[PDB]
Design brief:
This is part of a larger assembly, with chains A, B, C and D. Chain B is mainly α. Chain B contains three helices and no strands. By secondary structure, chain D is mostly beta strands. In chain D, the strands form three sheets. In chain D, strands 6-3-2-1-7-8 form a six-stranded antiparallel sheet, with no helix packed on it. Chain D has a two-stranded antiparallel sheet with strand order 4-5. Chain D is elongated and about 55 Å long. Classes of the chains: A mainly beta, B mainly alpha, C alpha+beta, D mainly beta. Chains in contact: B-C. Chains B and C meet through helix 2 of B and strand 1 of C. The structure holds two RNA strands. Chain A: One of its GO terms (biological process) is translation. Chain A: InterPro entries: Bacterial_rp_bL28, Ribosomal_bL28, Ribosomal_bL28/bL31-like_sf, Ribosomal_bL28_bact-type, Ribosomal_bL28_sf. Chain A: Keywords: Ribonucleoprotein, Ribosomal protein.
RNA sequence: GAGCUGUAAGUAAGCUUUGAUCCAGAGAUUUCCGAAUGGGGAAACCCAGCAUGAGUUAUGUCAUGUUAUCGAUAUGUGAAUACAUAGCAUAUCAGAAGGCACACCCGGAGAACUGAAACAUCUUAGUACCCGGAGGAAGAGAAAGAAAAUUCGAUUCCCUUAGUAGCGGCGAGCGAAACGGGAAGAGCCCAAACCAACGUUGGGGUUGUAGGACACUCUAGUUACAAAGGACGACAUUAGACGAAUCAUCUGGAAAGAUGAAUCAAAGAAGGUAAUAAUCCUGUAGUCGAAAAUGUUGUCUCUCUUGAGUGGAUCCUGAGUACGACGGAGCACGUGAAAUUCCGUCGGAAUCUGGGAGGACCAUCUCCUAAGGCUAAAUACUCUCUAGUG
RNA sequence: UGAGUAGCGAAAGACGGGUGAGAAUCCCGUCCACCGAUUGACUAAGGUUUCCAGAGGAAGGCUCGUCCGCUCUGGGUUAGUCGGGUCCUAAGCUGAGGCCGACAGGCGUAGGCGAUGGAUAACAGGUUGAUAUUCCUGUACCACCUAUAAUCGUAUCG
């Protein structure tokens, strides 16, 4: 249970390359932040991405 | 009849079978063909009573 | 009820212990309280005591069935089967 | 094919040409016991008894001329009947 | 249609033309463990609450039903704390759970021995294993496409193009596509502008040889996509029935063999029978049959149903999206002059006189119209069926 | 083949009777010898019918065998009080919600499970070829039910 609540942004997997072009598996996490947003019953604490929080939002 | 069908199976064909099995164990019961004949009589009585409901 | 299966006939049961004690074979899921009520209803006797014991399967390739024999002691009345 | 108590003739074997009455039947194995056929000697004194032969070794003679023949089924009546091949007369 | 009581010879007692056994389609019964679910537990065991019942002078005992945990829906729903948006209790539910087919399908995650005659880029390989979704198939699919012909016109699969173009410590090695010939073949529904109601969907409308809103001429389809709920006739599947034609002699313990004379064929496929059988047996060719239960369909029934819209000033489409930079992955193509496609992090367009593509990039021309969804057939595979084949 | 070769797993036996086709090896008796903080008498774990009786000698028993923990047939385990469940809890192991994790799943609260410990009512004799605080005889105790009599209540149970 680690993903944006307003979107589906999550982490992915890739490679780490060196000068000699050696490969090593790594992860690409997302910029998650704990925020309290309005929900129909009451506000709660959820994980919201920083991309969704841009241009304004309700908290 | 509902009651007659029950009465015939409970007191008869059940206590009657009790004597046959009891008599055989003691070693004084011939006519072995009378046990299976009564065993299947109860099976038919319980088949009509279950479908008649 | 249909809890008794077979009377036991042996030297220990018939020649001895038969003066006032009767041995039977009961179901493998009945306690000694249900054997006292069944004996009286079928044999019209008054039971005073009831002992029970378990037997395990015996290899004979396969094994014989398990048994449970009970001994009842009557206060008044006699079976005389 | 051959019913109990019918009259048949031995077509093959050591007693070819011996009329008899079937007195037993073994449909599970297709064998039939015919009186006077396949007598055997057993040890237990010596009690002579009749063995069973194959059902394909006996034929049914015609009622009119006693001639070995095959059985047919006309099935005119509600119950099917056995009809002699050589003559329509029922066998 | 006369025998029967499994494997199995016996020893017993019995049933059966009042038609037993046996075969097929429907119903009844179905102990305990096991997702196991009243609570425990060393699976097949032990110990309880509630309600209703018999039994017993009463206690002890017994029988039949109910009581797990999570979800979506009623009802009450008074705490910190005088709106209340914590908890907390009862009610309803063909709602979930677990199990397979060393097989096929999509997604997440992801090696090594080996080859390069060593070895790190590279290869073995997105292979083995693991996990999580399914379905009888899945997936993909109605052009922001392929191209350069006086053009074609959704997707998938087969042949060919071709070991060609190209990629590569340009080493080892990897490896296309479009045209052309085939199998199969139908396409549709939403958002928006707008017209009526007090964040239920009610109308309206769906796109490039530009559409719709807005102004304007004016008598069919079927639940396999395209909205979906039934009533109505015929073929097959699961027990069966009828079914042509041979007699002697010799050698044998036994004839079907040998020796003679007769026969049937829309039947000379086979298997048995005391030895090698078209005519002895079971069958074959051919021709018939279904209480009752399934499946495939055909008919009327049933529901649902208004289509061409010449102007054309004003209005409408899908945004933190398209795209750029940085770090990665994927396209035959290793960052390379790398277009086209994706993920994480930041910055951030336009609005039909618009926007995207044609292998960097610009101009001209040509072809299309992204940021919403659904869709059968041609293809892959075989636990286990019913007929067969070498 | 080696070869009728190695070996036959710590130790005291002798004789007289019995059985039988067959006796150094089985049964009975009398002497002798060995252990005796013990090779004796009871009991947990583990094994799972090896326990008793009659009948057997193919194979198994490192020889023999008439014998057996071997083969066949039929038998044998009795609890309100003894040891465990309807009593408690250590370690530890599992935990409604909850916290954290690519997927699985990892932690953890209330609550439960869990003796090797705590609580807790029976003793002495007799009897079978094979069971005994269980069966039997003689005397006890604990919990719970039912009916009938003592304080002539502003008690009693928590």
């Amino acid at each position: 249970g680690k993903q944006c609540f307003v979107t589906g942004r999550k982490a992915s997997t890739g490679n780490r390359r060196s000068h000699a072009l050696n490969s090593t598996k790594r992860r690409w996490n997302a910029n998650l932040q704990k925020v309290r947003i309005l929900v129909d019953g009451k506000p709660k604490k959820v994980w919201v991405s920083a991309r969704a929080l841009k241009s304004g939002k309700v908290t | 009849l509902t009651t007659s069908e029950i009465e015939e199976q409970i007191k008869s064909s059940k206590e009657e079978l009790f004597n046959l099995r009891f008599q055989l164990a003691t070693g004084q019961l011939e006519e072995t063909a009378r046990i299976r004949t009564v065993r299947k009589t109860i099976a038919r009585l319980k088949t009509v009573a279950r479908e008649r409901e | 009820r249909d809890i008794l299966k077979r009377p036991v006939i042996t030297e220990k049961s018939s020649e001895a212990m038969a003066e006032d004690k009767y041995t039977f074979d009961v179901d493998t899921r009945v306690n000694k309280t249900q054997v006292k009520m069944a004996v009286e209803e079928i044999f019209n006797v008054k039971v005073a005591s009831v002992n029970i014991m378990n037997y395990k399967p015996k290899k004979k390739q396969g094994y014989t069935n398990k048994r449970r024999k009970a001994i009842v002691t009557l206060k008044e009345g006699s079976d005389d089967l | 094919h051959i019913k109990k108590g019918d009259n048949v003739k031995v077509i093959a074997g050591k007693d070819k040409g011996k009329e008899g009455k079937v007195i037993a039947t073994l449909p599970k194995k297709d064998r039939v016991v015919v009186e006077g056929v396949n007598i055997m000697k057993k040890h237990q004194g010596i009690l002579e008894t009749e063995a069973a032969i194959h059902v394909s070794n006996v034929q049914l003679l015609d009622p009119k001329t006693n001639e070995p023949t095959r059985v047919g089924y006309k099935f005119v009546d509600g119950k099917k009947v056995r009809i002699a091949k050589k003559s329509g007369e029922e066998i």
